[PDB]
Design an enzyme around this catalytic site. Structure first.
Site, PDB file in Angstrom:
ATOM      1  N   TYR A   1      46.648  48.278  49.224  1.00  0.00           N
ATOM      2  CA  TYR A   1      46.282  49.327  48.254  1.00  0.00           C
ATOM      3  C   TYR A   1      45.853  48.697  46.923  1.00  0.00           C
ATOM      4  O   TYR A   1      45.716  49.434  45.947  1.00  0.00           O
ATOM      5  CB  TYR A   1      47.469  50.248  48.103  1.00  0.00           C
ATOM      6  N   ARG A   2      45.644  47.390  46.905  1.00  0.00           N
ATOM      7  CA  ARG A   2      45.125  46.678  45.699  1.00  0.00           C
ATOM      8  C   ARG A   2      44.619  45.333  46.168  1.00  0.00           C
ATOM      9  O   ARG A   2      45.284  44.717  47.008  1.00  0.00           O
ATOM     10  CB  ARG A   2      46.221  46.537  44.655  1.00  0.00           C
TER      11      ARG A   2
ATOM     12  N   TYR B   1      43.664  39.278  41.540  1.00  0.00           N
ATOM     13  CA  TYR B   1      42.752  40.365  41.969  1.00  0.00           C
ATOM     14  C   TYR B   1      41.365  40.146  41.392  1.00  0.00           C
ATOM     15  O   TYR B   1      40.533  41.047  41.606  1.00  0.00           O
ATOM     16  CB  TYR B   1      43.328  41.727  41.575  1.00  0.00           C
TER      17      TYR B   1
END
Ligand SMILES: *Cc1cc2c(cc1C)nc1c(=O)[nH]c(=O)nc-1n2C[C@H](O)[C@H](O)[C@H](O)COP(=O)(O)OP(=O)(O)OC[C@H]1O[C@@H](n2cnc3c(N)ncnc32)[C@H](O)[C@@H]1O
Ligand SMILES: *Cc1cc2c(cc1C)nc1c(=O)[nH]c(=O)nc-1n2C[C@H](O)[C@H](O)[C@H](O)COP(=O)(O)OP(=O)(O)OC[C@H]1O[C@@H](n2cnc3c(N)ncnc32)[C@H](O)[C@@H]1O
Ligand SMILES: [Cl-]
Ligand SMILES: [Cl-]
Lengths: 525, 525
Positions: free
Chosen positions: A474-475, A90
């Protein structure tokens, strides 16, 4: 300076560095390439000066964070604050904007402040990782369990601020988060919930207050800097028993998911959300790619069969755990075994029938899950980084309604789009309680620009394909922020518009990691 | 007009009323005293035009709500929107400001839109009450339970927006809320979470999105108007069995609470948070005050003993329920019975050993709780309104750390303060999971200005004394909002100031129910 934030001269930056040094201490303000380099994304998908921080500061206290934020406001220098900065997949510790000054709070702010056995909670500073909280609870003698993610270096606090997850009954880190201290973008200290009431002993007990619940505002956002967080901890049950369920066929996925849902939705007999992973995911935890396939293109069906046959697992593996006295465990294990063994070819093991044995790789795979699911952190999954040289990941993680048929379709489409780009596809499906996660963990060569581009292109296509089907992410990695934000398009992006209104209210100068989750301050829109 | 908002002239107000009438329909915009007075607080503690609305509108749709909000912004007219408007003990349907236009959403927006058995959720509009959702689930055939509050006319949505609670394992309504449609203060429609993503089937499954989780912003706040809400529903277990535990001594409360905590904190064998009520609360559900004591002064020990002996209950009663297959229920009931029966004089019953029988008021009391705890809503507790003529309540409900010793001190102090003001004290104590609630339900004469003043004076002293001991209120009547908000004083009320920044971000004209939870828009500060 290795990089400068847009709008800030070398002289202005040098003055800011001088004020950070004067107030924090010069030992804790780092501009040397050797140190700052370490906070670049480990797993980039870009080749140039994108996402490169200018400097790193190691604050020692909430007061240090407050003074750093005031200096950043004075100079218009963006900040990126993190706890561990190990948000691999991420962005790692990398900021949204080149030239951002990084705040690595966990370097020095790393204490377990409190373990309460009677009320089953701990209080952590940013730098407490799963390993350190496990050890502190062990040394306390408290009969409490932690809930770790897959890697024991993850920050208890940092992972929670990403809405991250583990694998016990307490898997939803955001649910057991209770009571935060937060430095706001003007330098003011906020205590959420009952921490606002002087003398309250309920700061880490009751996630409430008169008025709105705002802890969720600080997830996947750029509104404040957390300096302290309560984490409620599951009381240790009398016994815990883990299981592995091996499925012979790639095409068993629908039946696995339809079997899982009714056993999980009532929180019994699946007391924790089991994982459903493909053979390649388990293989990468215990083996290198070259054991299965010497050719560098997409894994063949025969290479995947070799993995199954040599490791003694399945094309799909379910892992879960039962908790409580033996009388309850034995009832639940029988319901689970009976349900899944209706799938032709299925095989069921426990950590009792498949105990950990040197060189029995299937036993090491189950042992690794049994540890995580019983609150013992490890870094077993770090072996995926050795799958080939410089293997890293870059997550595609959509959420959808539980459906066997739709899981098989996501799988088959993700296999096709990943094979189109030559990128290896490690898959995990999860029914949490009522929702279905598809975790696509690609392994690509983080050192190879061509592999980076294929992985970024592949993933932008997965986002588009997922969005067309109603599957939302959602991430997301820094580089994906705007694309994923733009998929929440209802009413001209009213969600992002609402995020921007809150951003401008809480961070008028737009100092905190601009563009986090596609949330840009007014000065950059 | 019966009342007008400060700063809005009759001419301006008439012009706004003419626009509401033209757009919504004159039959749905009411300014007559007979119709608007219905929406004044049923349980006031004030005597004048405090908290008296000017008008009520019955919107028919989300679009109607949007157009009303736009008109309200143009004229600067404050709005108070609610679902059922039965927030008894917290202001009923009454607005914070005299002259507020009331939006009773639930009059016309009253459909159950979905009962999803496979994924165990329902979707409700504002006007769906616990009775209606229970009937809709029953008639659907779906094997799902609802989680009602004590009164079956409560709004599923409206109770949730107050962080209200019930008594099943799904007692925390805010936890099972998932997916809201909200008209924001500018008239824009927001869909929270996965409702932002067109096509998503996960709006009511997964309380997430990329970026911040903001459904908690709409609890006890004035930031938007909810037109639709998902409510996740417990799957119906094979069996359920309720129990009553009677304790002979007022002084048994510390041991009761200290026995409860370790049985609840691990969610077994107390699978739902039990209640611990005093004899007066139970008596007031099955009898009137004069059945026990004709003297109008404070209840004597002898009157409370008459309640204990004649109802055949205890000075403290624990009510709980066990859920699951009988093998599991029988194990938990044996653990619970064995624990509590070590308190000298304690007596244990289940709804099987004390089944509902005419004349058997103990059996009626257990049956009423068994109903709530098994998802069958009722209005049994509405009998407390008949304890004496015009009896109503005004809640003091602080939250604290679990502690027998502190529970007993709160009880003794509240008995003393309530005795001093001539107010009857109905008491419940609950350990939710790690937190302790003290629910002080006073009964006063709602029609009598002297009784209103005694109740308000008593309650402000309870809030003051609670705050000095670190016991904070997290739900309060309109008239108490500023005092309670002021107790969250950490860092010069940084909580209130952060609420205010969000308020001015999301409601720049300060139209929505100004002062809710002590949150005042910039134009009134
Ligand atoms: C490679 C990999 C990753 C992974 C995983 C398996 C593999 C093979 N399994 C995971 C899992 O089971 N569960 C999960 O949630 N994540 C999993 N990952 C991803 C990653 O390893 C972990 O999530 C990791 O724990 C996250 O990194 P870390 O814990 O170090 O968190 P961080 O970088 O410090 O913070 C992340 C972001 O949150 C905000 N942040 C964090 N701390 C603060 C503070 N104090 N103040 C304000 N914001 C904060 C920032 O946005 C930061 O970037
Ligand atoms: C007297 C009494 C009260 C009581 C109780 C027992 C007795 C004897 N037991 C309760 C219990 O077990 N649990 C609980 O949560 N409350 C209990 N109470 C209090 C009360 O009866 C209930 O809470 C009741 O359900 C609340 O009233 P209602 O359900 O009708 O809710 P509302 O008045 O419509 O709304 C309350 C406030 O929420 C905001 N709100 C509501 N709807 C909206 C929408 N659509 N949009 C925006 N805001 C909304 C408003 O602030 C409103 O005033
Ligand atoms: Cl991890
Ligand atoms: Cl109620």
């Amino acid at each position: 300076f290795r990089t400068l934030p847009d709008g800030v001269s070398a002289e202005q930056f040098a003055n800011a560095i001088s004020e950070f040094s004067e107030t924090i201490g010069s030992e804790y303000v780092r501009v040397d390439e050797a140190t700052v380099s370490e906070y670049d994304d480990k797993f980039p998908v870009t080749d140039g000066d994108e996402f490169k921080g200018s400097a790193v500061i190691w604050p020692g206290s909430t007061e240090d964070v407050q003074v750093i934020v005031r200096i950043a406001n004075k100079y218009g220098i963006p900040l990126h604050a993190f706890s561990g900065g190990r948000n691999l997949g991420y962005g790692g510790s990398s900021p949204m904007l080149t030239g951002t000054v990084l705040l690595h709070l966990g370097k020095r702010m790393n204490r377990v402040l409190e373990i309460n056995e009677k009320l089953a909670y701990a209080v952590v500073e940013p730098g407490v990782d799963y390993k350190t909280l496990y050890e502190a609870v062990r040394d306390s003698g408290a009969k409490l369990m932690i809930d770790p993610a897959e890697l024991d270096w993850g920050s208890v606090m940092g992972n929670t601020m990403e809405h991250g997850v583990g694998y016990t009954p307490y898997a939803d880190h955001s649910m057991w988060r209770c009571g935060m201290e937060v430095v706001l973008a003007d330098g003011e200290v906020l205590r959420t919930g009952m921490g606002g009431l002087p003398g309250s002993e309920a700061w880490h007990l009751y996630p409430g207050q008169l008025g709105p619940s705002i802890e969720g505002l600080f997830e996947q956002s750029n509104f404040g800097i957390c300096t302290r967080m309560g984490m409620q901890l599951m009381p240790t049950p009398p016994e815990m028993l883990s299981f592995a369920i091996y499925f012979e066929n790639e095409d068993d996925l629908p039946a696995i998911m339809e079997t899982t849902l009714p056993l999980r939705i009532g929180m019994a007999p699946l007391q924790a959300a089991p994982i459903v992973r493909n053979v390649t995911f388990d293989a990468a935890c215990v083996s290198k790619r070259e054991e299965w396939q010497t050719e560098p293109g997409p894994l063949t069906d025969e290479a995947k069969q070799r993995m199954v046959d040599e490791l003694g697992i399945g094309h799909w593996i379910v892992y879960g755990t039962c908790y409580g006295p033996r009388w309850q465990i034995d009832k639940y294990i029988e319901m689970i075994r009976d349900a899944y063994l209706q799938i032709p070819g299925a095989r069921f093991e426990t950590n009792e029938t498949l105990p950990l044995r040197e060189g029995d790789r299937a036993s090491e795979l189950l042992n690794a899950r049994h540890e995580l699911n019983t609150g013992v952190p490890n870094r077993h999954s770090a072996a995926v980084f050795d799958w080939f040289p410089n293997a890293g990941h870059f997550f595609y993680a959509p959420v959808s309604a539980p459906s066997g048929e739709d899981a098989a379709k996501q799988y088959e489409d993700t296999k096709r789009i990943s094979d189109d780009h030559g990128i290896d596809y490690l898959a995990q499906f999860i029914i949490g309680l009522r929702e279905m996660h598809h975790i696509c963990l690609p392994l690509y060569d983080t050192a190879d620009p061509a592999s980076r581009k294929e992985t970024l292109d592949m993933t932008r296509e997965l986002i588009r394909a997922g969005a067309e089907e109603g599957y939302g992410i959602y991430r997301a990695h820094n580089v994906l922020a705007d694309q994923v934000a733009e998929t929440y398009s209802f009413n001209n992006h009213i969600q992002r518009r609402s995020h921007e209104r809150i951003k401008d209210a809480l961070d008028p100068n737009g100092i905190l990691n601009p563009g986090k989750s596609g949330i840009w301050p007014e000065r950059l829109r």
